[PDB]
């Protein structure tokens, strides 16, 4: 279990607080009384790692033309895009492979 | 405090009404890096000016072509006159190059605006706008 | 309130004195989108700084060629030293392309300036500057 | 007063650790046009945010090639999460052109940042960054 | 006659005011007493439509090289530019037409 | 000897002050009592001309690849760069000269 330093909002006693697991975020920080409240990431948001964000990260990757969802927006990861079946990635552009071609690589004649 | 908005790109819903016309862009206004505060409202492609004063206004639109030129215009709309005002233009002729190019166009300046004014961003070709991520195409304004 | 100016392009009167030199541009200072306020004065290619402090300074110059490169420089001039200071440079090599091109160059940053300083914008070639409209080539500054 | 920094380029010490990674740039923070003030500190490629609020952040990186594309990213780093946030991206595909080209890439926008956040500028290829003068490659931020 | 909503500067009674015709602008807004004062557009300014601007629009179009005044700056319209007799418009550049060419179109051999 | 107008910091009597020579800068301005204090330019700074700067100019020119110090950073001038022996300057790029080439010019076969 990871941990983080924090000073209390009521009366500022510096206490070591509990990190929130992937899928969650610090909804309320730990007190001298209670531990850290981890709330679940809301729709279209994620936390992939043990964190102490007070707000989940937004799924901010949209798939373009010549592109499909390689990975959906989960509460534990961002959305990811690969090229469509007709195309392969190169320099940032998803482009065609000329048969007489995997989303990662150009297959040859 | 002071009216501020930073807006980020979304997928563009390709409109049919464009009689040799530069369409406006749709923006995100609350998710990720996008925010609006202190009465600076985003509705329906416009940013509504709540308070008269001097504003710094900026936008970047990243273009990708997979077209003679590419253009961004930031436009002021008022009810007091039927035609808009072009505040800023960034226009770039597109080199023959290779038909697999990408380019940003960045604009930012200071303008005296009036309560009730609507600011919008227009592009030469909506299908060339890169909408894939919020850090590449954005639009913002703040009262100085 | 605070010293502010947004200046817009005008037709450039082509000067003869340029010994391998970058000429300054002439600006509009009161018509259309151009304004100056709160002691920020425009005279004779310069913007006069009335009050010492930190200023955001910006300019766009749109170039059209119908030339190895194109350059914009924003320059600070003081009486206390005979040579100017180059605050910002935007330099872009011109592609062989087609001899019918256009390009903007945009610069903006923050500088500590002193009462009495003169700011001006210099270009590599005045005959390449697009002067046709106020939204394409502009120059501005405001005290933060 | 308000946290402000304008930073200028220096010679880049080419690091070995870059696993398909965009390295950060080193900046000057006190000489020439470079300054930092009001608790806005520069250490070790980062600009440390002293005070939570809305900041205008900007950078230009001039690239010269004597490469498919060139990219600048302004990045926010927090201790609260292991991965950085990309605030701004300026990416430009490099034309076949002539292998003697130069280009600026300019970015500037407004972001809500928190006390303790670190801002840095990353480039696609450090060996393409023009470091020769302070007016060509710069990086700055100021609390609005 | 078009019309516009307004609240009085003296004592804020919401009254419907008269629009100003092309060539004019709202110099003084309408009161409970008097109607809207429309003043004439000053030199190098215009209003093309029924409006309630408190300031006329500036004639902000300058004709470039390879260009002539298609339309002068009137009080009722902005200045407009066409190409010169030697040139025709294309993509934003006024360029030559090669005889062995109207300002709008390229005539052929 | 060049000169400059100034108003006193203690009691604002407008007096004509002495300029500082190349290599120096105004460390303290002239008073009704004493003349102008010129201090020497600090490391990596310069003043090339008679001036009244309160701060010397920074040596802000770094030599790139294909480049060598044509002139070092002195207290009386900025650093300057020429190309290396293998290269000549053109448009801002220091590039090679093909023998079967001075730092300024391309020598031919």
Curated annotation (Swiss-Prot), chains A, E, F:
It comes from the Eukaryota. Disulfide bonds join 17-30, 20-38, 41-56, 59-73, 63-81, 83-94, 100-109. Detected in fetal lung, brain and liver. Detected in adult stomach, spinal cord, lymph node, trachea, spleen, colon and lung. Highly expressed in several primary tumors from colon, stomach, rectum, esophagus and in SW480 colon carcinoma cells. It is found in: Secreted. TNFR-Cys repeats lie at residues 1-38, 40-81, 83-109. Decoy receptor that can neutralize the cytotoxic ligands TNFS14/LIGHT, TNFSF15 and TNFSF6/FASL. Protects against apoptosis. This is Tumor necrosis factor receptor superfamily member 6B. It comes from Homo sapiens.
Curated annotation (Swiss-Prot), chains B, C, D:
Residues 1-144 are extracellular. This is Tumor necrosis factor ligand superfamily member 15, secreted form. The chain holds residues 93 to 251 of 251 of the full protein. It comes from the Eukaryota. Residues 3-144 form the THD domain. The record marks 80, 83 as: Important for binding TNFRSF6B. It comes from Homo sapiens. It is found in: Secreted. Glycans are attached at residues 41, 122.
């Amino acid at each position: 279990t990871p941990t983080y330093p924090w000073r209390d909002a009521e009366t500022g006693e510096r206490l070591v607080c509990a990190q929130c697991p992937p899928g969650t975020f610090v909804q309320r920080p730990c007190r001298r009384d209670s531990p850290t409240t981890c709330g679940p990431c809301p729709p279209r948001h994620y936390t992939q790692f043990w964190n102490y964000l007070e707000r989940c990260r937004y799924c901010n990757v949209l798939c373009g033309e010549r592109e499909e969802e390689a990975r959906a927006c989960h509460a534990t990861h961002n959305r990811a895009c690969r090229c469509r079946t007709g195309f392969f990635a190169h320099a940032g552009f998803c482009l065609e492979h000329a048969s007489c071609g995997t989303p990662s690589q150009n297959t040859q004649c | 405090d002071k009216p501020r908005a930073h807006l980020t790109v979304v997928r563009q819903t390709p409109t049919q009404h464009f009689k040799n016309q530069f369409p406006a862009l749709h923006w995100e206004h609350e998710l990720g890096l996008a925010f609006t505060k202190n009465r600076m409202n985003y509705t329906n492609k416009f940013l509504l000016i709540p308070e008269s004063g001097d504003y710094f206004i900026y936008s970047q639109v990243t273009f990708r072509g997979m077209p003679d030129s590419i253009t961004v215009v930031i436009t002021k709309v008022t009810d007091s006159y039927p035609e808009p005002t072009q505040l800023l233009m960034g226009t770039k002729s597109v080199s023959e190059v290779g038909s697999n190019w990408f380019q940003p166009i960045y604009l930012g300046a200071m303008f005296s605006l009036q309560e009730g004014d609507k600011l919008m961003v227009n592009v030469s070709d909506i299908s060339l706008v890169d909408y894939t991520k919020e850090d590449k195409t954005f639009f913002g304004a703040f009262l100085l």
